[PDB]
């Protein structure tokens, strides 16, 4: 019994498979994480932001 | 333990229920399929493209 969570920023995203036992924890991290990083701009050249989906998971971790 | 894949083109899409055991195969088909067909144009009258979600699954098959 899993549940999808989409860690996303601009035009790239990663689908995270979150167990439903602890989703109320992970979904509140999703909102708190998606506000500190600035506004997306084509090329994603801003060093605070990820350029690739691999970097976005890194920024979350 | 299933996983959503969205076969999509323009304004119509079908959600495909892919088992997670073989998703690395199916997700690479999704990228290779979504590049050979041309750019969407309202009415979807182009014969290379689908007009209906039924045709889009047909084009994939």
Curated annotation (Swiss-Prot), chains A, B:
Oligomeric and partner information: [Alpha(6)beta(6)] hexamers of two multifunctional subunits (alpha and beta).
**Cleaved signal peptide residues:** none
Function, please?
Fatty acid synthetase catalyzes the formation of long-chain fatty acids from acetyl-CoA, malonyl-CoA and NADPH. The beta subunit contains domains for: [acyl-carrier-protein] acetyltransferase and malonyltransferase, S-acyl fatty acid synthase thioesterase, enoyl-[acyl-carrier-protein] reductase, and 3-hydroxypalmitoyl-[acyl-carrier-protein] dehydratase.
State the name under which the record lists this protein.
Answer: Fatty acid synthase subunit beta
The miscellaneous remark of the record is: Present with 91800 molecules/cell in log phase SD medium.
Q: Which domain of life is it from?
A: Eukaryota
Gene name of the encoded protein: FAS1
Q: What is the lineage of its organism?
A: Eukaryota, Fungi, Dikarya, Ascomycota, Saccharomycotina
Hey, which family's this protein in?
Answer: Belongs to the fungal fatty acid synthetase subunit beta family.
| Section of the entire sequence shown | 5 to 65 of 2051
